[PDB]
Design a protein around this ligand. Structure first.
Ligand SMILES: *[C@@H]1O[C@H](CO)[C@@H](O)[C@H](O)[C@H]1NC(C)=O
Lengths: 48, 48
């Protein structure tokens, strides 16, 4: 399911108009969330 | 990870940071566990 267009997006949204998306009925591959760049912050609360 | 922090290189310890202000279900608790072994032996220990 598409995470490319929500990350490789040309135009983003303002802080007061923070952009919403809902994802359901898909398979999520959270490994290809690695080459966004050299050095980025990845913190998650609740699960390992 | 050559012994340095980074992505996929996480230090396997975490902290609590207890403050008097959190909710009733988050304060520290003190736990002690007593283990016995009821078998055949010289019976070193028992009560009054
Ligand atoms: C789209 O985003 C992914 C996220 O990891 C990235 O790997 C990929 O290179 C991006 N697409 C392009 C054309 O750069």
């Amino acid at each position: 399911c598409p995470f490319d267009e929500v990350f490789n997006a040309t135009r983003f949204a303002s802080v007061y108009a923070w952009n919403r998306k809902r994802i359901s009925n898909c398979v999520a591959d959270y490994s290809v969330l690695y080459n966004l760049a050299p050095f980025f912050t990845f913190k998650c609360y609740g699960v390992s | 990870c050559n012994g340095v922090a980074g992505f996929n290189c996480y230090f396997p310890l975490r902290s609590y940071s207890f403050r008097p202000t959190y909710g009733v279900g988050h304060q520290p608790y003190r736990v002690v566990v007593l283990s016995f072994e009821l078998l055949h032996a010289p019976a070193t220990v028992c009560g009054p």
